[PDB]
């Protein structure tokens, strides 16, 4: 079933954190782990899943629970997600979830799939993200949508955002969820903690799949 | 908003036809995007060519070098150029447009399920 929009009160106010906007920031930057028809080499613990990946080298990718880790452990796969360094153990880069089948899963072109950014409830602008994939994570649609806003609205700076707060949401026929782009109020933002919302590994269809995204501003 | 489409007919393959529509409900400085969708007898609508409010266009791969989409301000009409029409090209052809923004729509989607207004739909048929 379909997750309740938010309420004003349940969003992240960003003139709440004091800490430092871009340890956000770079994690919607260029550089994000892709990796194309690869296949888990080892496992740290059972909710994980280590993959070799070209950084132009290992890859742990954790999971939400072991029934993903288990789907995913011998299967040739697709994995896209924002990554990290800072607390990343195992026994160098880390993410969640971000990762999809290979076979069966391929578009011949690539689709493009709309934004619609609204600022202080007005119709601001539209843009296009794309994949070739059919079912998508909503993490590589999330990555892809700030990475195009921090670009062209300054989403994240250095030291603050000038938005007030921000959420994505995705709709799927009847069905919707939400996720907030503001990091939670106080001086520390960990990488590690923010990014682990997407270990559910959540999947949508790139046929059907509608984006939008509001901002209020200071 | 209303789009309300001309310029369907009937034409032998290799022909050309001229689809057009004049959407009403728009400010003059409404940017929004627009597309020409089709749908075939027992088959998907699908996107044939969109056009954003600064002009940038997409188009399905089958149609390509075929046809071709624009607006014309001064006439508040966007256009489909159909040259070299094949009996695949045979279907209901729809106008479609999105939601204006105040910045700019960049969008080109070719996904129904992206636009927010519909035409009635004109008979194009080669044969």
């Known amino acids: 079933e379909s997750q309740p929009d938010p309420k004003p009160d349940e969003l992240h106010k960003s003139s709440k954190f004091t800490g430092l906007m871009e340890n956000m920031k770079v994690l919607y930057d260029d550089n994000h782990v892709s990796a194309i028809n690869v296949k888990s080499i080892d496992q740290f613990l059972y909710f994980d899943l280590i993959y070799s990946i070209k950084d132009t080298d290992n890859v742990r990718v954790e999971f939400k629970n072991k029934d993903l880790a288990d789907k995913y452990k011998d299967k040739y796969v697709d994995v896209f997600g924002a990554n990290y360094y800072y607390q990343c153990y195992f026994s160098k880069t880390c993410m969640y979830g971000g990762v999809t089948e290979h076979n069966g899963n391929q578009l011949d072109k690539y689709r493009s799939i709309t934004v619609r950014v609204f600022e202080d409830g007005k119709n601001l602008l539209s843009f296009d993200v794309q994949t070739n994939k059919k079912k998508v994570t909503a993490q590589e649609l999330d990555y892809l949508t700030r990475h195009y806003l921090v670009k062209n609205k300054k989403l994240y700076e250095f030291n603050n955002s000038p938005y007030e707060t921000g959420y994505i949401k995705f709709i799927e026929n009847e069905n919707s969820f939400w996720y907030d782009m503001m990091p939670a109020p106080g001086d520390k933002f960990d990488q590690s903690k923010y990014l682990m919302m997407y270990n559910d590994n959540k999947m949508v269809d790139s046929k059907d799949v509608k984006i939008e995204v509001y901002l209020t501003t200071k | 908003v209303q789009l309300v489409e001309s310029g369907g007919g009937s034409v032998q393959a290799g022909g050309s036809l001229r689809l057009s529509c004049g959407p009403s409900?728009?400010?003059?400085?409404?940017?929004?995007?627009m597309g020409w969708f089709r749908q075939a007898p027992g088959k998907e609508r699908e996107g044939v060519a969109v056009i954003n409010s600064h002009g940038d266009t997409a188009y399905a791969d089958s149609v390509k070098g075929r046809f071709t989409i624009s607006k014309d301000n001064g006439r508040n009409t966007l256009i489909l150029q159909m040259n070299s029409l094949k009996p695949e090209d045979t279907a209901i052809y729809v106008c479609?447009?999105?939601?204006?923004?105040?910045?700019?729509?960049?969008?080109?989607?070719?996904?129904?399920?992206?636009?927010?207004?519909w035409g009635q739909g004109t008979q194009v048929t080669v044969s």
């Open positions: 409900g728009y400010s003059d400085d409404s940017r929004f995007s």
């Open positions: 479609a447009s999105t939601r204006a923004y105040q910045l700019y729509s960049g969008s080109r989607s070719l996904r129904p399920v992206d636009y927010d207004y």
